[PDB]
Amino acid sequence: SMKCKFCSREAYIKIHYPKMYLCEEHFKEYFERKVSRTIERYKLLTKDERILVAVSGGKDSAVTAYVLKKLGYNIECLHINLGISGYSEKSEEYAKKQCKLIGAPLHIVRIKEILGYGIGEVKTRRPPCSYCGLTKRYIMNKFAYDNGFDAIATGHNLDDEASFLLNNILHWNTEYLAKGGPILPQQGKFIKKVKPLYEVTEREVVAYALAVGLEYIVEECPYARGATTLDMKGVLNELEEKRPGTKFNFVRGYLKKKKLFEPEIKEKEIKECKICRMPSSGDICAFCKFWGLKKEINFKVSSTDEEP
């Protein structure tokens, strides 16, 4: 077995791009520095901002919160319990454990308490994974807005971006290809969304979580029909194995040529929801229409979990 390129310790991991062997400690430092560089590169965050980390219970958002906290950022965390019996309880417990170890405040929103129904419970023909993303994205935006947070940070890694690009390139979804990247800058009541793990691989995320002692959910959604992302991920991993830096250069190259997909948006119709005043297309937004809401949900909090 090879040793660390920086110290006299057994190598914990081998980085393929650039090729090197690092120990448990020099990898942690490498990872943290690589995330720090991503935040500097695309001017993601400042240390004065109040950051809201959307924590799922999985590795990605747990490591996002951990690294940002270690780098000395002003973070708070949000976990959305989608009320899936036999999945949401374990995921909520995992998020609690993570935020406890990280030492960051955790806010929990239970959709079965707010909207009455959990995900998969509503009388719908549409799959539960479709209105899932709509429910999470809205709740994390309105929570951040209602509580005056400057930015939202998600767990999306290099593999997530590479697979999203590959999938939309294959389908020629030029509108989705124009809206990618590490920053979704603040547009009205839409809080700034950032991806600090944009240039780190899922493999590096797994190794970092194991090293710092972060326990997480690997379990995918039980309501899922098809493994499209896993198919794209496996394919890009095969390509990466032969040519290291494939994922990186594909994503970085895309940022240089994203401008070409920009004339595809052509959208200029902006409205405010009659129920919650959040950005809408028409009288009522997709969220209030789907959940059959007559009144606005206020996510503004004073007394957070274990606080007065």
Ligand X SMILES: Nc1ncnc2c1ncn2[C@@H]1O[C@H](COP(=O)(O)O)[C@@H](O)[C@H]1O
Please report whether residue 270 would count as binding ligand FES according to CB under 6 A: no
Q: Does 163 bind ligand X (CB under 6 A)?
A: no
Select the binding partner of residue 51 from ligand X, its own copies, Zn ion, none (C-beta < 5 to 8 A, by kind).
none
Site for ligand FES in 138-177 (CB under 6 A): none
With CB under 6 A as the rule, give the number of residues binding ligand FES. 8
Q: How far is CA 29 from CA 25, 33, 79, in A?
A: 6, 6, 27
Q: How many Å apart are CA 195 and CA 183, to the nearest integer?
A: 7
Q: Does 54 bind ligand X (CB under 6 A)?
A: yes
Interaction mask 205-234, its own copies, x per CB under 8 A: --------------------------x--x
Here's the x/- map for ligand X, 138-157, by CB under 6 A: it reads as --x-------------xxx-
> Rounded distance, CA 280 to CA 290, Å?
13
Alpha helical stretches, state H, 147-281: 158-170, 174-178, 202-212, 228-242, 246-257
Stretch that binds ligand X, among 12-20, 50-58, 114-122, 257-265 (CB under 6 A): 50-58
State the nearest-atom distance from the C-beta of 262 to ligand FES, in Å: 29
Residue 263 CB, nearest approach to ligand FES (Å): 32
Angle at alpha carbon of residue 119, lines to 215 and 276, rounded to 5°: 105
For 277, the token pair is 């005043």
Task: Show the tokens assigned to 122.
Answer: 């509503």
Nearer to ligand X, 60 or 161 (CB): 60
Bind-site residues for Zn(2+): 4, 7, 23, 26, 273, 276, 285, 288
Helix orientation angle between 59-70 and 202-212, rounded to the nearest 10 degrees: 70
Say if residues 32 and 23 touch (Cβ distance below 8 Å): no
Instruction: Give the C-alpha separation, 272 to 13, whole Å.
Output: 50
Binding mask 161-190 for its own copies (x = CB under 8 A): --------xxxx-x----------------
Question: Considering the complex, what minimum distance in angstroms separates the CB of residue 22 from Zn ion?
Answer: 6
Residue 57 CA to residue 100 CA, distance in Å, equals: 12
Binding ligand FES (rule: CB under 6 A), the pick from 108, 217, 221, 284 is 221
**Which of 138, 153, 155 lies closest to 74 in space, CA to CA?**
153
Candidate list 285, 291, 297, 299; residue touching Zn ion; CB under 5 A: 285
In whole angstroms, what is the distance from residue 308 CA to residue 304 CA?
7
156 touches which of Zn ion, ligand X, ligand FES, none (CB within 5 to 8 A by kind)?
ligand X
* Residues engaged in binding ligand FES (CB under 6 A): 82, 119, 128-129, 132, 221, 223-224
